[PDB]
Amino acid sequence: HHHNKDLKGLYAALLVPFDENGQVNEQGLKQIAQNAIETEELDGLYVNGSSGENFLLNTEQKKQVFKVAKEAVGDKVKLIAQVGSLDLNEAIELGKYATELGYDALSAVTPFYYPFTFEEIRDYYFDIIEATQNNMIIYAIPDLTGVNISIEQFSELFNHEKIVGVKYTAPNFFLLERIRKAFPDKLILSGFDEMLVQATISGVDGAIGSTYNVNGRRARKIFDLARQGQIQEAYQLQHDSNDIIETVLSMGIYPTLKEILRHRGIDAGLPKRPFKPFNEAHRQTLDQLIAKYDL
Amino acid sequence: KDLKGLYAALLVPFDENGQVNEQGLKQIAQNAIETEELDGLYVNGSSGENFLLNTEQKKQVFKVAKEAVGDKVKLIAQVGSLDLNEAIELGKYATELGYDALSAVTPFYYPFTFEEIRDYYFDIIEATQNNMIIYAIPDLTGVNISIEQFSELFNHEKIVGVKYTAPNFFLLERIRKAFPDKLILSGFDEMLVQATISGVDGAIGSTYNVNGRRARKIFDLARQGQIQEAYQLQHDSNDIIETVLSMGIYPTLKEILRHRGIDAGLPKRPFKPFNEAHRQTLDQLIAKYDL
Amino acid sequence: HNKDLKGLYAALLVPFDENGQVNEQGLKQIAQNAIETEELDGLYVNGSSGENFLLNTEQKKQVFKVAKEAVGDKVKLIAQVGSLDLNEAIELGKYATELGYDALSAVTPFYYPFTFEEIRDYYFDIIEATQNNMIIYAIPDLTGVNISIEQFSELFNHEKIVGVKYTAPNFFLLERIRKAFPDKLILSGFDEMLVQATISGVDGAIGSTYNVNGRRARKIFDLARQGQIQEAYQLQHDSNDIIETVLSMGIYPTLKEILRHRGIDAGLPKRPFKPFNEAHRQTLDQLIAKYDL
Amino acid sequence: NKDLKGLYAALLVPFDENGQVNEQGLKQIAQNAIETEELDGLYVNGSSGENFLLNTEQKKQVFKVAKEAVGDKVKLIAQVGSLDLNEAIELGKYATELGYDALSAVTPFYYPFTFEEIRDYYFDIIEATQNNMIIYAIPDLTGVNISIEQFSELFNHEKIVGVKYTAPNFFLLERIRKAFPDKLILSGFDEMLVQATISGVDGAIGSTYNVNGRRARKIFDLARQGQIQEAYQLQHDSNDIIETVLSMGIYPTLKEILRHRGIDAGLPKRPFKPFNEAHRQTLDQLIAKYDL
């Protein structure tokens, strides 16, 4: 019954603080990590994903993020390693690395940019797994990648015993339900924070999110209350969170989330160029959001 | 009447020449209210093959539907058309028949500006004096209506709500919050449970013609907090919905009703009749879910 | 004998009054302007440009009849009868055939997600009932409907599907179609890309802006085919200034405003299209003086 | 200080089984583009070179090998665009120190960057390298569209000297052409070379020119000579080639055409799959029919 359900829970998609030269701030990274567990009371980190600006880093920076995040948390804390890269050699090297550190599972975004064939995408996942022997979590983000995965295609992927589930962000709830019903034996972690409540009643096993770095407590309440049948209160907390998410998005989500962390005393530094620093023309509105929701 | 609740998007049976089978139409209407226990009918919508009809057929449908059902049945008339004159004329005829509100698809095909789209709704309201329900269906029309555009529409005291089909639950949420006193009726049968926990006041659907009981149970159980059960029922409804789409929805839905002894006739060309090659699979569905 | 349908057509504009009723005398002036002033080979009638999809059946007939009575017997006349209502499409196709239009045309059925087999048989039904030649009208940007080459060949296999009014913005698809169907009429419908369309082997063009810019359009088409490509292109530069400007202002109302400045009773657009905005007038007059419209 | 008009090969790269660069093979591909295909230049480490699959050393190696493989009459453009701005700067410097005539960069993708962010990514690379820059716009792969307004702001930088244009819109191309008469426009859709030519492009960069450049130049010359019907006939032929190679997996197949000439074409880098032998006969017919 609990087969493949080990990595259930709520996960922060770890944010990364940089210095003026795109270099990782290690003490700040350590702080954001500890904030996700200790303050936001979350189950795990999903490390070197979209939110950690992973795709702007060189190979050594990524390793560095994999190392500091595991150092900064206790053994009870679930850890997923996003090692997806267009460079399959890099992703294997990062895969072996993350595995040897004790990350409980790997994840990889679907290959993008090039119009890869399904067969090509499938064997990208098969090759990472072959070389690393770790469990693998599909990361489907069609809004950034342009890549869509039919139900027939998940069936082919989920047919590998080491492809354990999916970080699901397509916004389609007909698809999510088909998937949920077709593959009950597989983990589905949802990736759209602003739709947590809908994903919960669609039977997701949990969620991964950028905004759970600042709003992990409301997010837990949303997930737990919906699973309890307290729909109305879950939805009201989803209103609050959607105020939050909509505001962060209109200011540049990763810098803004990082400014919210700064305000708690964290050294959240800067985003990596070409991402721009938080624009001060947004500061007041950001402070109102913070006061109002006590972030 | 307050317009809350569950509506069949009324299907229409046609003969070989694409003419309305009045007697089968009466039967389809009575099936929705009496057998499927629905609150009302949404008449001349997408599911009634409305956009294939001429003006007289439209009137004929409005008349036969209204005459077929109890006085206390909620009735919404989709009068939306690319021909504004036609829509005004149809809005008047249905209002005079006693339809409780009007509904109109966002003008489509031509790339109308928002202002143009706005005053089409306002011209319709002005000529008819009936309440109006926006029919938003971007998958069919290519027209999206942003939150600010909903604000301006909803500022009109006679635009009392939306039949919402955009597959976007972040926007559904924002609209639900920004407009707590407007009517929201969801249009995606396959996502009724997600729409319900999102605070819609009801739902309009083509598959409620055959599966309105299950639909009611999703809406009620989800709101009473029996969410696991609501969701299981959605799993079941989505087998039904998936099969039917794969077979051509309107004719397949009509084949299901024909099975109950209803004279569900034919789809209007250029839709093709139900393909016999699907019948076994359809029979298995009907048998499995007692349709 | 049948006319060679090759050539340059106005997508005919229609003037209305305050109530969305056809202004017949203006419509006549518009049809005469296209042929006598703009010097075009023919009329494509009740197309997108005639605000056709806004009309009732009686109105579409009216427009078919006025357009035909307005031009000489030499003038090529194509009737757009595409409609979601197949019965109406057939009644219109027969009415235009009886008027003596040289070909029918029909937009691909839209709104509903029709099947390709369904789109095909809508066309075959129209032909069966009218016995006229049929021109497919591909406007994927308004319909959201696309036709692949295999779908075009299944369509073009009908001997009475004589061609396509092609408005997809894909010059790879167009080349393939040009290649695969040398025996079929391809008329391009993207006025702003007439030069590229000519050099790709189109048999002519249908277009709304030819109502005011037909002289330049003909020179683009002639010069491009004579290999005077640099001058051809310069006239497309100038033509696209005009297209872009009227686009920005609401194309059908603005084109009818230009017709108005020639003394034509171009009336109003049919609502929900709004009338030409006075705030654009100055710019339009400058455009009119600079390109002598 | 060359003007950069003309026909470029987007240079393909041959790999071994472990995704490593086959150098000897690379040299043959550069020389085939220049010597056999009679082209003005190479666009190096672009989409066609499986660039975005490579690590940083690999991109250097390609830049270095391609450059050593050709003479000084040969115009060279270094595509250094990268989600990693540090890396993009690093490569830009390296290419510029090797003598590349200009740099090029794909618009930052994956993340939904704002325009200001896209603009300053280009400005920083210029700042750091001081070479000329060529915008690589490829909306079909990136989902990034550049408006005429955004081109004007970009082209306002004296070092942004042009654009490799692969958008499929000829109204926009014509607009661009008219508004920026002083800038370089190199079209990137091989299947639309003729239409781009008569639309006033200064030349073209393409993957199929590795095997069909001779035929390409004739499209480009004939259409300018106004030998339009002939140019277009050669576009027909070319598009039979393009369509056939696309249906088989463009980069591997193109490299298999090169093998028939005795080039050590190697393999593509995974997750790209090697040319599938089920296509062999059809490819051989194509090579035979179009004399490749």
Author numbering:
A (entry chain B): -1 to 293
B (entry chain D): 3 to 293
C (entry chain A): 1 to 293
D (entry chain C): 2 to 293
From the paper:
The effect of Schiff base formation in the S. aureus enzyme is also similar to that found with the E. coli enzyme, namely that it causes ordering of the loop region (138–146) which is not resolved in apo structures. This results in a repositioning of Tyr137, a residue noted as being involved in substrate stabilisation and/or catalysis.
